[PDB]
Amino acid sequence: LQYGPLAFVLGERTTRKLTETSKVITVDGNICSGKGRLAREIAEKLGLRHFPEAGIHYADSTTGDGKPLDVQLSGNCSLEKFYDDPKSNDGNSYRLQSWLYASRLLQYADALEHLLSTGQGVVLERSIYSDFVFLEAMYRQGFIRKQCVEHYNEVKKVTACEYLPPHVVVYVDVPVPEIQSRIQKKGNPHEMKITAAYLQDIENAYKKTFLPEMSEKCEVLQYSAREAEDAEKVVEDIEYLKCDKGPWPDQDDRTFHRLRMLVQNKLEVLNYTTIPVYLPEITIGAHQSDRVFQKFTELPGRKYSPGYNEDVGDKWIWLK
Amino acid sequence: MPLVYMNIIMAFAIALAGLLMYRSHLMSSLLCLEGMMLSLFIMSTLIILNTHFTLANMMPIILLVFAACEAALGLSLLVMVSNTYGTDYVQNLNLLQC
Amino acid sequence: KFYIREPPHGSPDWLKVGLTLGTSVFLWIYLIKQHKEDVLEYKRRNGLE
Amino acid sequence: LLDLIWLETILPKTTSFIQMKMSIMVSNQKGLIKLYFLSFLITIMISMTLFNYHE
Amino acid sequence: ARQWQPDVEWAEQFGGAVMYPTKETAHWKPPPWNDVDPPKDTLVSNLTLNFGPQ
Amino acid sequence: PTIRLQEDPDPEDENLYEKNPDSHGYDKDPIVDLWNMRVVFFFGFSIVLVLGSTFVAYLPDYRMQEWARREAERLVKYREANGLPLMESNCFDPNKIQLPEDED
Amino acid sequence: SDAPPLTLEAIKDRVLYVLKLYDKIDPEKLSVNSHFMKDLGLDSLDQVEIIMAMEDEFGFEIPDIDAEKLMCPQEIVDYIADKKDVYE
Amino acid sequence: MNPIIYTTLIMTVMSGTMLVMISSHWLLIWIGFEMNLLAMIPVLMKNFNPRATEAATKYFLTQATASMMLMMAIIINLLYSGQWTITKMFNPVAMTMMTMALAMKLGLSPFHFWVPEVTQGISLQAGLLLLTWQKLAPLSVLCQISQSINPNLMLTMAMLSILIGGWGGLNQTQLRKIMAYSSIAHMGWMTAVLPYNTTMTILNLLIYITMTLAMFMLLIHSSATTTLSLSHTWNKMPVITSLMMVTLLSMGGLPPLSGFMPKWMIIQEMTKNESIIMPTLMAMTALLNLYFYMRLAYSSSLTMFPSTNNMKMKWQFEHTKQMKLLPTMIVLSTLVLPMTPALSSLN
Amino acid sequence: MLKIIIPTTMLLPMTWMSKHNMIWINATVHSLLISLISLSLLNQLGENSLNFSLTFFSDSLSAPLLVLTTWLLPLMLMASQSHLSKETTTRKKLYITMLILLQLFLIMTFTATELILFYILFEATLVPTLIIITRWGNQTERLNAGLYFLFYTLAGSLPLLVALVYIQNTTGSLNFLIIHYWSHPLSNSWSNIFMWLACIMAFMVKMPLYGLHLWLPKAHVEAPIAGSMVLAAVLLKLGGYGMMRITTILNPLTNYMAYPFLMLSMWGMIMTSSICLRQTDLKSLIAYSSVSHMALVIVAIMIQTPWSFMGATALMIAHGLTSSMLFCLANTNYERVHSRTMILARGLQTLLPLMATWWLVASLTNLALPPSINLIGELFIITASFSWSNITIILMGMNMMITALYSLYMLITTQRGKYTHHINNIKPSFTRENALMALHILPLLLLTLNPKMILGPLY
Numbered sequence A: 001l002q003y004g005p006l007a008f009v010l011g012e013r014t015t016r017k018l019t020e021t022s023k024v025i026t027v028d029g030n031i032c033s034g035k036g037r038l039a040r041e042i043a044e045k046l047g048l049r050h051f052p053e054a055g056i057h058y059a060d061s062t063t064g065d066g067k068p069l070d071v072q073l074s075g076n077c078s079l080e081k082f083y084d085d086p087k088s089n090d091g092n093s094y095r096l097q098s099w100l101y102a103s104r105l106l107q108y109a110d111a112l113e114h115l116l117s118t119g120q121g122v123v124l125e126r127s128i129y130s131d132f133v134f135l136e137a138m139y140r141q142g143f144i145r146k147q148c149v150e151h152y153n154e155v156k157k158v159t160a161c162e163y164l165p166p167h168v169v170v171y172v173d174v175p176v177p178e179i180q181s182r183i184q185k186k187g188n189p190h191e192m193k194i195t196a197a198y199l200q201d202i203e204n205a206y207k208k209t210f211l212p213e214m215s216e217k218c219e220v221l222q223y224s225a226r227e228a229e230d231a232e233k234v235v236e237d238i239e240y241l242k243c244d245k246g247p248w249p250d251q252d253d254r255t256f257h258r259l260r261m262l263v264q265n266k267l268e269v270l271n272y273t274t275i276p277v278y279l280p281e282i283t284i285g286a287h288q289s290d291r292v293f294q295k296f297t298e299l300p301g302r303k304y305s306p307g308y309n310e311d312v313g314d315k316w317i318w319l320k
Numbered sequence B: 001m002p003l004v005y006m007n008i009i010m011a012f013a014i015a016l017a018g019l020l021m022y023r024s025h026l027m028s029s030l031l032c033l034e035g036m037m038l039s040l041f042i043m044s045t046l047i048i049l050n051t052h053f054t055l056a057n058m059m060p061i062i063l064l065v066f067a068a069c070e071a072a073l074g075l076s077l078l079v080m081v082s083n084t085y086g087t088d089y090v091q092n093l094n095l096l097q098c
Numbered sequence C: 001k002f003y004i005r006e007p008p009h010g011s012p013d014w015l016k017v018g019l020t021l022g023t024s025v026f027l028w029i030y031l032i033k034q035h036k037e038d039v040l041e042y043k044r045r046n047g048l049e
Numbered sequence D: 001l002l003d004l005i006w007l008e009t010i011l012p013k014t015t016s017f018i019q020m021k022m023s024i025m026v027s028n029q030k031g032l033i034k035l036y037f038l039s040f041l042i043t044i045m046i047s048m049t050l051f052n053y054h055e
Numbered sequence E: 001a002r003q004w005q006p007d008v009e010w011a012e013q014f015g016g017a018v019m020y021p022t023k024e025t026a027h028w029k030p031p032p033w034n035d036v037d038p039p040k041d042t043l044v045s046n047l048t049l050n051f052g053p054q
Numbered sequence F: 001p002t003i004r005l006q007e008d009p010d011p012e013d014e015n016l017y018e019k020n021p022d023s024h025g026y027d028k029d030p031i032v033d034l035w036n037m038r039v040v041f042f043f044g045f046s047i048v049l050v051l052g053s054t055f056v057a058y059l060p061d062y063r064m065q066e067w068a069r070r071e072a073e074r075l076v077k078y079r080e081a082n083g084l085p086l087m088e089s090n091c092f093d094p095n096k097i098q099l100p101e102d103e104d
Numbered sequence G: 001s002d003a004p005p006l007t008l009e010a011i012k013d014r015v016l017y018v019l020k021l022y023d024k025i026d027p028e029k030l031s032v033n034s035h036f037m038k039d040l041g042l043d044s045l046d047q048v049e050i051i052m053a054m055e056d057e058f059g060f061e062i063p064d065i066d067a068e069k070l071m072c073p074q075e076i077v078d079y080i081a082d083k084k085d086v087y088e
Numbered sequence H: 001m002n003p004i005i006y007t008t009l010i011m012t013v014m015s016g017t018m019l020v021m022i023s024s025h026w027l028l029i030w031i032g033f034e035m036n037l038l039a040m041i042p043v044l045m046k047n048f049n050p051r052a053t054e055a056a057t058k059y060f061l062t063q064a065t066a067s068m069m070l071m072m073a074i075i076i077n078l079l080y081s082g083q084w085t086i087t088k089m090f091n092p093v094a095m096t097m098m099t100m101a102l103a104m105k106l107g108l109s110p111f112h113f114w115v116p117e118v119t120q121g122i123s124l125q126a127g128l129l130l131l132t133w134q135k136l137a138p139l140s141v142l143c144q145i146s147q148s149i150n151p152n153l154m155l156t157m158a159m160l161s162i163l164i165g166g167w168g169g170l171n172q173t174q175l176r177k178i179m180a181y182s183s184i185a186h187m188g189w190m191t192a193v194l195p196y197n198t199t200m201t202i203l204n205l206l207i208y209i210t211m212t213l214a215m216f217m218l219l220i221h222s223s224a225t226t227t228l229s230l231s232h233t234w235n236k237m238p239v240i241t242s243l244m245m246v247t248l249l250s251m252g253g254l255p256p257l258s259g260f261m262p263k264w265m266i267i268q269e270m271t272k273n274e275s276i277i278m279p280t281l282m283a284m285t286a287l288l289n290l291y292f293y294m295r296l297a298y299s300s301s302l303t304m305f306p307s308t309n310n311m312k313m314k315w316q317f318e319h320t321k322q323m324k325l326l327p328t329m330i331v332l333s334t335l336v337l338p339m340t341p342a343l344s345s346l347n
Numbered sequence I: 001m002l003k004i005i006i007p008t009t010m011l012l013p014m015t016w017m018s019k020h021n022m023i024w025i026n027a028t029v030h031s032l033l034i035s036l037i038s039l040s041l042l043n044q045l046g047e048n049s050l051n052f053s054l055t056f057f058s059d060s061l062s063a064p065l066l067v068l069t070t071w072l073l074p075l076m077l078m079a080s081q082s083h084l085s086k087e088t089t090t091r092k093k094l095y096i097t098m099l100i101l102l103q104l105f106l107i108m109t110f111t112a113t114e115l116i117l118f119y120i121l122f123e124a125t126l127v128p129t130l131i132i133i134t135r136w137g138n139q140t141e142r143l144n145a146g147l148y149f150l151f152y153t154l155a156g157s158l159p160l161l162v163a164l165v166y167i168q169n170t171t172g173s174l175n176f177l178i179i180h181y182w183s184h185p186l187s188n189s190w191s192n193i194f195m196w197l198a199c200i201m202a203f204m205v206k207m208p209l210y211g212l213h214l215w216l217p218k219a220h221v222e223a224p225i226a227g228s229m230v231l232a233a234v235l236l237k238l239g240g241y242g243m244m245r246i247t248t249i250l251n252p253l254t255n256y257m258a259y260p261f262l263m264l265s266m267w268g269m270i271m272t273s274s275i276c277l278r279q280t281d282l283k284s285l286i287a288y289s290s291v292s293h294m295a296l297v298i299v300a301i302m303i304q305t306p307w308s309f310m311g312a313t314a315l316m317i318a319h320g321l322t323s324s325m326l327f328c329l330a331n332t333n334y335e336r337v338h339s340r341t342m343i344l345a346r347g348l349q350t351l352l353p354l355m356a357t358w359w360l361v362a363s364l365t366n367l368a369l370p371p372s373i374n375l376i377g378e379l380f381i382i383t384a385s386f387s388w389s390n391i392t393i394i395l396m397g398m399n400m401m402i403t404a405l406y407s408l409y410m411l412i413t414t415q416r417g418k419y420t421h422h423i424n425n426i427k428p429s430f431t432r433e434n435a436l437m438a439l440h441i442l443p444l445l446l447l448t449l450n451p452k453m454i455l456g457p458l459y
């Protein structure tokens, strides 16, 4: 019995599952910080499910087999090319930013569904609430136009309004020269082309806008590079928080019912990401749309519904 | 028909004209609705009393009950509109066109 | 295979399949019997047989 | 003169123009109840007089 | 050598509030993507009262 | 980008003679194309065109043209033998016609 | 429909009508290029009052900055044209 | 809103309609209308989104004015004859008042103004309810009093509804307003034949209801409320767009589809009553509805509009909740004409 | 009659269950076999029709039309499969489904005994044609053309429905046999005048009559090759068939009300033939020649004589074959140069000699060279018109001189002269195209030896 109004009528409620450890936690920070390791250790210590940061192929890992699909059939954008040519005339930068926002929205829906169905907490690296810091740095560096920013804000206005922000916002603050040195030592040839102005703009967006408006609804935990490696201190700091500022205690059983009916059915989650606003960076002609959709359908397990593909070993199809 | 019957019918017609001609306030239109209900009550009661239809004497009372359900409904809407605009003016109800 | 287990899979829901087939068979049997009784009643009323 | 202009002008172009004008006239309502409720009052009076007063 | 299909310039004719824009109707705007208008932050004034001295 | 979208370039047409110098212009697959040619030729020229035309040519005289000629021959023979007119101006016997009362 | 396509001549006419409505200025004297201080003998507070009158006339906020320079009618017309995006 | 409260409000709406349709007393019919409106107001406001508040306020005002007129017609009929049974309305002034009140309840022209606004203001499910279930009670009342309906007034209102629906639909890019104008035109078709044959009215109502259910369920499946949003469906679900095009063809009245059956059955009936000009005008006027259905078919299925990059994400997910009666609705709304004589089961 | 209808219906599941690379072969073979079976309807009586059942009947007028309809389907499939090569399997199956549904509707239309059933099928033929034009056309005008096709027809045919259900309410039946046996004269009144107009304009729009012909140069030009073939060959003849059927109940009013249509046809013949002389689009030239040819059929039906009816039937069949061939011939060059402009590609006889022979034969049949059945129908109509009025010889003769002028012009512009230098992609003709032309032209010439099979019921 899939959750729905009938299951709400006979019994099942979500407020009974919450046991003070729900605590949706997001661990933000600039590029090449230690936020991923810190988030993994936090999820290990607190017994929470960890969600690795959503990339271009995040949606592939949740559908069919978790293997990533071709970049043509999924994403249609390249981060490596974005580092190589941030001002390319094929619209790669904003297409990548919009795809990443959609992936973050999908991952947030998945995390909220997990929390509301099992009661166990979730940890994330970034979220839809901190995605914009990459957009602003893109716009201030002249990589995207103003129309792309307006389209991003239109998509964010009608999507983020349907979800509850995280309880705990962990920020790892690492100065620009240190992340520059870490990038140089990392060895990725594409990642070394990041200008210090880009990283400075990301930091400016994080500190000037994101954290001030995150701190007015819940407590924010800022840490430095050296004290981020001490995960037990951060974990007990989270343990001794006083969460009384967010809307999470102000949530009833009917509000949780609506939210849980929204977090499943991912088609409704992604409804407004494809609004009919025709920007060249993301609009695709009819011929290319048709060719790529036909190419997607010819994938081994994508022609029918998940249980009705005779070419991946599904059986008893004629009786389902 | 006596003069009382056409006086009650005229009161109903006046209240209907008052409802159909909005000025600014929704509350004024709701008052016109209540006035129409009152004229209907008086007319039906007069007809029932004149003809000594004994059972029908319960009919006007029922007519009153569903009058209140209409008032309480309308007032409810007047709250919500007010909460959107700080005013019960009918000019603010223009988001939807034809 | 697939990432999510896809609970609806190679083992079809046999309760649902049995219910569907039973409903179809019961409907067909009822229709056959109804037609037989209708023919008998019609022939009885019209003095044919 | 005939095939591409006047035969077009008389039957199909005139029809499309008239239908478009009528559509614009019909659908151009600002959505104010104060206007079409007064229209309702006019309609009710016209029905009471034209149709009911001659049966 | 390719069949014509609609492009952005063709599709934009159906994106307005009405099919045939008119001088007065050209100022009509399409409804929001969700049917949610921006909240009208109407300033509901508080009553200001003197308590005392009398 | 001064372009309005991401679109595929218009592809150039394929010449069936490039990969199949004897192509018949039915399909890209040589065997399927050859069998399409054979089936079209056999069922269009050999079956419908020849056998159908022969069938139409030898259709029996259901229109009764020979019958009408024979009946006309018999009537002409009889009427010339008796001396009666070959055709009558009236197709219906006037004894079976009931005209209205009077001419005025 | 909305407001008509206002032109530069309309801006100039409204500006000069407002200025001739000021008591401390003789109407026939002032020109389009006349400085407020040097030609008309006005001080800073009179210029502030004139700017507020312009704000009332054209209905948009002119900050304290970008008002310390509008020193003849002509620069006022330029400021209004730039803000309202009119060119002809 | 709680699912139990939603279920009880839906039950109250259907209970009001049933009370209207099973009552022999005018007071109980009026009570059924009152109950239906009372339970219907919150259904339109299920999602707050202040446009729904505007739609509910407009709907309440219109329906309450109609209810007041209905009660006055009842009381005048009682005054001129001490009768409470629903019958041929012994007084003609009361008959005119009731005809106007029921036309206002249905949305016939020139009382049609509220329908496009209310339909656009509410969600698609609320619009489905408003355009399908809400027509039963006034039409059921009209069928019971048809022998006393003044043909002139009713036919004038029917012709006005057909003309106005056809003209209003032409200027619409929003799908809900298109549905509303289609509803107005079909209402006019329904009430045109009512004084002559109520079986044809019932047949038209059933065919219109099944076609409307098909269209609304299809627009729910692909969450599109505008033309440009519906132009993206081919790149996600081509089958949905194909079935939508076939249903749109049926609603235009094209043979051999189902939507041809009512018009064909109405014109014939109107001809047996020596009405020739009226059916000809109605048949030629329905071509406007056909045109603005065909424009939508052009936008959604017969051509391919440009799409967006994020649509690729949507390729990886399936529609979760499924409408079980949608296939039956589509089949009944398209492939039913050969079973036309079954209409004799409706009388 | 079901021995033709049911196999046509079985073509649909056969197409949908066929392999991805076998749909064309199966469709062509089985449509050819259905043509072979449909040949048996040519065995007609001399007195009455073939009344198979209460629903379907066959006549000396409808049997040749049925044979032409069934024969056209394999040709449409052969001509379609080249430009639909890059198409997905499901959409090819949908296109073939459109063609099969059109054929089924036409077969049922030409044999329906009852006028309302005939009307329903004659309207059902609109949906597949509209879908074909507006979905598989090549240019952006295909949408507009579709609308012109849809509303020109319906605006004419909606009154007809109103008339038909009217007649059954006064005579009691719409069966064509009962209608013919129980015929009564039409009195001279305004009501009868408008009943005459309602029963005629629907078919006149389909011919099309000059004045209401604007939909044809759009629909035929913007449609794909199979769409234009079916539109020219069969769908135009629906109006002629309907008029020939329904003129039974219109006498003697037709003696008075035929004058405006007769004048329109006799002058629009000249007008369309003259238009053909100045046409930059070859397909548009062919489409206008269709209107010029169909005006003669309208005249013949209006004057109501046995010779005129025989000529109308023969001309209808001959025009179907000739116009289908001309459209295919134009499409062959279109798929080479991808333009419909006549003067773009010249001197093609040097580069494609056998296709030049096909062009010459098609042009010869277009200008009614004796003893082609085109000439037979034309001459019979001209003789009947001469009996109707001698002065008609002035117009008809003029038409002939113009018809030969724009035909050979069309032949000279595209075949003779010198080839254009820059066009270097003109490949040799395929066996598919040559066989398509041969299967167009061979029956046309074969019908000369047995013309009574296309001369209709008045023979």
Ligand SMILES: CCCCCCCCCCCCCCCCCC(=O)OC[C@H](COP(=O)([O-])OCC(O)COP(=O)([O-])OC[C@@H](COC(=O)CCCCCCCCCCCCCCCCC)OC(=O)CCCCCCCCCCCCCCCCC)OC(=O)CCCCCCCCCCCCCCCCC
Pocket (backbone or CB within 6 Å): A005, A006, A009, H001, H002, H003, H004, H006, H007, H008, H010, H011, H012, H014, H015, H016, H018, H019, H022, H125, H128, H129, H132, H133, H136, H202, H209, H213, H217, H220, H321, H323, H325
């Ligand atoms: C001439 C002959 C022909 C006659 C023709 C008749 C007319 C033809 C059809 C007319 C038009 C039909 C229009 C249908 C409207 C549908 C609206 C709707 O519900 O939403 C749309 C819905 C929304 O889709 P969705 O987005 O996926 O859903 C999201 C949820 O809505 C998200 O919301 P949620 O989260 O809140 O989910 C809650 C959900 C889940 O529900 C639950 O969880 C269930 C929990 C139980 C709650 C316990 C409640 C008990 C307490 C309440 C008691 C109330 C008492 C009232 C009585 C008072 C008496 C005075 O419940 C619902 O969604 C709706 C519940 C519906 C309940 C219906 C009850 C019927 C009432 C009947 C009353 C009559 C009584 C007798 C009267 C006597 C006189 C007085 O879409 C559809 O349902 C598809 C359309 C299907 C329509 C039916 C098709 C045609 C009918 C065919 C059947 C055969 C008919 C003939 C039978 C003849 C006799 C045998």
Ligand SMILES: CCCCCCCCCCCCCCCCC[C@@H](O)O[C@H](CO[C@H](O)CCCCCCCCCCCCCCC)COP(=O)(O)OCC[N+](C)(C)C
Pocket (backbone or CB within 6 Å): F048, F049, F052, F053, F054, F056, F057, F058, I035, I039, I064, I065, I067, I068, I071, I317, I443, I446, I447, I449, I450, I454
């Ligand atoms: C490439 C090289 C070219 C040159 C070299 C070729 C060598 C010469 C070959 C050409 C032959 C010349 C023809 C000369 C005429 C002789 C044939 C004639 O005798 O047959 C006719 C017979 O012709 C047929 O009747 C006509 C055939 C019917 C055509 C139907 C087409 C097949 C259907 C295809 C579908 C097309 C749709 C059409 C819609 C109507 C006579 O008709 P009829 O006077 O009676 O017969 C009298 C005796 N009977 C009655 C006992 C039989």
Ligand SMILES: CCCCCCCCCCCCCCCCC[C@@H](O)O[C@H](CO[C@H](O)CCCCCCCCCCCCCCC)COP(=O)(O)OCC[N+](C)(C)C
Pocket (backbone or CB within 6 Å): H203, H206, H207, H210, H332, H333, H336, H339, H340, H341, H342, H343, H345, H346, H347
């Ligand atoms: C699109 C086609 C229509 C679809 C409609 C829905 C299909 C599902 C069937 C609905 C099930 C309910 C009917 C069967 C239950 C028993 C009915 C019985 O209880 O009620 C009788 C009534 O029976 C129903 O009327 C018969 C229902 C049959 C509906 C089918 C007719 C469709 C029209 C023909 C189009 C072809 C479609 C066929 C299906 C593909 C009592 O008759 P009566 O109370 O004295 O008359 C009421 C009306 N009066 C008083 C005003 C005269």
Ligand SMILES: CCCCCCCCCCCCCCCCC[C@@H](O)O[C@H](CO[C@H](O)CCCCCCCCCCCCCCC)COP(=O)(O)OCC[N+](C)(C)C
Pocket (backbone or CB within 6 Å): I188, I189, I190, I193, I210, I211, I212, I257, I260, I261
């Ligand atoms: C672009 C192509 C479109 C298609 C063209 C269709 C043509 C339709 C025209 C129909 C032809 C005749 C119709 C009616 C017959 C006669 C009409 C009239 O002109 O003749 C006189 C009619 O008298 C008067 O003139 C009345 C008619 C005047 C009003 C009609 C308007 C004519 C103006 C042209 C309109 C254009 C038609 C096409 C619309 C687009 C005859 O004198 P009268 O002896 O007394 O009446 C005899 C008729 N009876 C027996 C019924 C009594």
Ligand SMILES: CCCCCCCC/C=C\CCCCCCCC(=O)O[C@H](COC(=O)CCCCCCC/C=C/CCCCCCCC)COP(=O)(O)OCCN
Pocket (backbone or CB within 6 Å): H274, H276, H277, H280, I152, I155, I156, I159, I162, I163, I166, I191, I192, I194, I195, I197, I198, I201, I202, I205, I212
């Ligand atoms: C591409 C455009 C083609 C245009 C097609 C439209 C032409 C159709 C001509 C009129 C159609 C309506 C006829 C209805 C069917 C006739 C049945 C009948 O006989 O009824 C008449 C009624 O006839 C009418 O009422 C018809 C009047 C016209 C009403 C609609 C006007 C439509 C336009 C008419 C003028 C145009 C005609 C030519 C148009 C040519 C194309 C431009 C008499 O019946 P009773 O009342 O019983 O009389 C005996 C007892 N008293």
Ligand SMILES: CCCCCCCCCCCC(=O)SCCNC(=O)CCNC(=O)[C@H](O)C(C)(C)COP(=O)(O)O
Pocket (backbone or CB within 6 Å): G043, G044, G045, G046
């Ligand atoms: C209803 C009546 C209510 C009355 C309420 C009165 C309120 C009193 C408010 C008092 C506030 C002050 O004094 S504020 C103190 C003002 N003092 C100074 O500014 C000192 C330097 N003076 C100058 O620079 C020029 O002389 C200057 C005059 C400014 C011209 O400026 P411009 O050179 O740039 O034109």
Ligand SMILES: Nc1ncnc2c1ncn2[C@@H]1O[C@H](COP(=O)(O)OP(=O)(O)O)[C@@H](O)[C@H]1O
Pocket (backbone or CB within 6 Å): A030, A031, A032, A033, A034, A035, A036, A053, A079, A097, A100, A131, A134, A191
């Ligand atoms: N919203 C975004 N926009 C652009 N690039 C992003 C975005 N999010 C992540 N990235 C890129 O993804 C890469 C790895 O992510 P990052 O968090 O910086 O390091 P890590 O997670 O491995 O510790 C980086 O090169 C970063 O720039």
